[PDB]
Design a protein around this ligand. Sequence first.
Ligand code: SF4
Ligand SMILES: [Zn+2]
Ligand SMILES: [Zn+2]
Ligand SMILES: [Zn+2]
Lengths: 49, 734, 331
Amino acid sequence: EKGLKTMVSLGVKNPLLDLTALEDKPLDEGYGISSVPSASNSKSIKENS
Amino acid sequence: MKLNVDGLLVYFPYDYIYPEQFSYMRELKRTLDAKGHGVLEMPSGTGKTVSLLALIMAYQRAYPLEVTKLIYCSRTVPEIEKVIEELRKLLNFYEKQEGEKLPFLGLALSSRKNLCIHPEVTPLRFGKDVDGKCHSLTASYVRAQYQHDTSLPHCRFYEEFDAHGREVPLPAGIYNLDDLKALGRRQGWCPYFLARYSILHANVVVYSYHYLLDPKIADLVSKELARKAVVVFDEAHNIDNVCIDSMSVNLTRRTLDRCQGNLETLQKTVLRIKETDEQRLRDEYRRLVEGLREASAARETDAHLANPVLPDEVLQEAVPGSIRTAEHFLGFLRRLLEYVKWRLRVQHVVQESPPAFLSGLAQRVCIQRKPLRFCAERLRSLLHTLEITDLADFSPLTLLANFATLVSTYAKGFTIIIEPFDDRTPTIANPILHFSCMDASLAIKPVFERFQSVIITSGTLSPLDIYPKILDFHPVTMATFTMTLARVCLCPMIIGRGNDQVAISSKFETREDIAVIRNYGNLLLEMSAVVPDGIVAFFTSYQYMESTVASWYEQGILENIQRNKLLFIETQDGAETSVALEKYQEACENGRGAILLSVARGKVSEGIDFVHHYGRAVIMFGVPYVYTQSRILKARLEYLRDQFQIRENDFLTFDAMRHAAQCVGRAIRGKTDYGLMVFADKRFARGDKRGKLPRWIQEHLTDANLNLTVDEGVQVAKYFLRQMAQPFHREDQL
Amino acid sequence: GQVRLGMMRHLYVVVDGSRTMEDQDLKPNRLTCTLKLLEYFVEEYFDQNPISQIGIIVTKSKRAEKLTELSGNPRKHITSLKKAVDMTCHGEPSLYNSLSIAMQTLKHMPGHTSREVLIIFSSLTTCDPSNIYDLIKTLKAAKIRVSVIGLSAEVRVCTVLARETGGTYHVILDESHYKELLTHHVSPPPASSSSECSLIRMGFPQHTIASLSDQDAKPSFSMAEPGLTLGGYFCPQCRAKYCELPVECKICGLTLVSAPHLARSYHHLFPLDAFQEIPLEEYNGERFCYGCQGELKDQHVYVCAVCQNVFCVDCDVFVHDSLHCCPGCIH
Ligand code: SF4
Ligand SMILES: [Zn+2]
Ligand SMILES: [Zn+2]
Ligand SMILES: [Zn+2]
């Protein structure tokens, strides 16, 4: 799954699975009103599992 | 069906409604008899958008003498496109009935993510970087340098739109985002700036909330348009949450370090441009002394960043103080940055009012109030002056400057709360600074001042009376819509009784109680064994869903749920949720049972609308209760006690029930649909919490269904589905 | 309907043998009730369509099992269902290999047979060896008609299967509704614009006893634990020896039919009409039943279309279910 998401890609992505819809998600790289989404800190044992 | 709606004929679009549509006419009969806002509640059964448009077109047809433009406002971009195409269906019906001449410029409008063409801007995925490269390729000064040379960068789209495109209005065509992009491809234009230029000529414009309620975006619908405009919000539960998201500002230590790097970069830029040029700085000092920074503001299309975050009526018209020389203004921002950085150093949670922060400023770093109001105007004029290109690099300092404006403008309604540490931030310094607001009314204030009659429609009839009180709001109509049915179409049950006769609750406040989670898993197992076409299971918090699906594994439950249906658990990745949703919708198409369990706060249940067969049984786990509240909640509740008159335990129950019935209240997308919607804990039976679910769900909540067991609820689900899978044809509805 | 019907009809019954057959929603578990109504189904289908055939697949443990081959006498099928009461019903059901074998036989078969499959299907999770969507596109392109009678739930998949193989999908409330559905699938369903309208060559063998006290007879055993057959039915194409006349010629390919077999299903072609049903007293100068000469002691009087005589409820049910003709219109 991580190879399909990171290394490998998909196939059925034209009008369906539109790039613009993906662009709308994830907000922006710069600081946002609710940037706190993916935290580089806070890696536990049970939560990671 | 040819309705008389007291002035006008209305051709019901397709020709299918319940008798509640006749009741629907009476509800807005009050709404437009007297103009003055008005809050409606049609549940999700009738055409939400279709219902909100047939009767308003009937009034404007009967007496369309006081309405220039409709501004629809739906939040998600698919809804923008969906509401435009339902309006386009209704115009196609309207022109099938009449003839060919149906002048009507329908128009969507979102952003440069969704209306930009250029194949070097387009592969960027983020909004600020698209804005930065669009600020690179066109501006007020790069456009002029291209205008007197040849090889300098330009879009060829905005230049060709500048060549001819600002004299031909778009002829009567209802445009989506895709159709508008295609017309931008066709003649060769920017459909973004075409849409913004063609706001002036439209009749229905459908954009988002933050494009209307933000004071620093919505500078594009003027006063004279607004004096005869009808604005219609749609799906308007979290209007107060949109306002508090729209005027609060968060500062972080990373933001201040990148602000320091920004300050050094702009210092070097001032030095090298002092080595380069002097004459436009003379013109800067002129247009500060002479005017009020409006000299080159006439030709300002892509030279506009986010404007001043004060509202439209609290801005000034004076001259910006001691600020004028850009060297001294860099010293000014240097002082303000170092004081806010020193203020953030405090290692305990500190709440202040903004005049206390202004006095701490004006005593300990000598910055007074009016040069701290004009900091936004100054940084926008300076950053226009020094020809600098990629403004995404200058996102923190503008933030800081805009923060300055709010601290120097508003008081007694807002609150500066400093947190040295948050929740999920172990062994990591993360001191942040919420300039948080808690007046909901101060953001829709100019929306009620300018506009004629604003209306909000909710598919869930959330307890409403409270909304008017919060929003400084006095409507004409508070009309309630009732689900008229020839078939039960839904049954809500309150399974608040375990199979061991254990009281199902979430009183423990996310610190696990074992037997209650056991009875939740037993409910999900047996409801899996009964229900077909998938099951949606909303929990309380992601920590609580985390902990529950943890203790459904060590305890031997979750393999049995696997044996009946296929789980798709949620995560807070933006892409993993979309893959889990796609496999959840593929499993239903495979025919194998699926079951999506999520959190009742996040984006999983915001955009999503219940499918005819995508969610049959919306399982609301828990009562929308959190466990990571700092003091924005305590402070907004102290405010609603003090200066409004709304209790603590009243507002908490109101907020929890609007989220719970929001995530469980769009089930009847089409009148002819059967939808199980269970509430799983005992608290939904306690009178005040049940009393704030909408009327069209309390009508079908039977006292026997109130506090069912797991297995009694499973047998009610079986009898529900068997009585409601038979041929319920159109002849049973007339 | 006054429409074309599929009267030669190789129907092929696919039963679940799933885990969900053992669920007790019916009064016995679903296997037992389903199998009892299939015994009734085989009985009424061979009672009404004599030319046609049935084959029974139990689908069990992600594999498909041709339990009783495609034949045209109820003894073997009902014997196999009395056997199949005693089964186990373990594992999920695969609808791939069974529909593949039924397709494989029902692709090259004579084009005039309305080749039909009836899937009595209960569970929800189905394992697909290939792609389910491509199987339906294939089965749409492969000449066959598949109808699914469903238990406990309705998958848009059974709707696509029913409307594409050209069939009809239904879900079950009761004993009585499930009997109504199987009774709906007894009758020959109408044909599409696709099925071949051929002219099958038929054979009509007379019965032949021992000529004249076996004066120069032909003593045979049989043709499908048999005794010494003295006489019976021949097969003129090949001149073999059959005991029962309605048997597809086992060594020629001819179909052998006695005079009643075609006349047992003539009522589909010149069908009945509706009875004008009127409950009230209403002008009745004919007090007695034209059916069986009895008084009308109830408030239901039923009057035909053409002759417009008088009938009661007993004559209504009897004429419309069994006698299949109006007694007036014969006169
Ligand atoms: S000017 Fe037009 S084409 Fe160029 S980046 Fe901006 S929106 Fe895209
Ligand atoms: Zn022969
Ligand atoms: Zn007659
Ligand atoms: Zn009679």
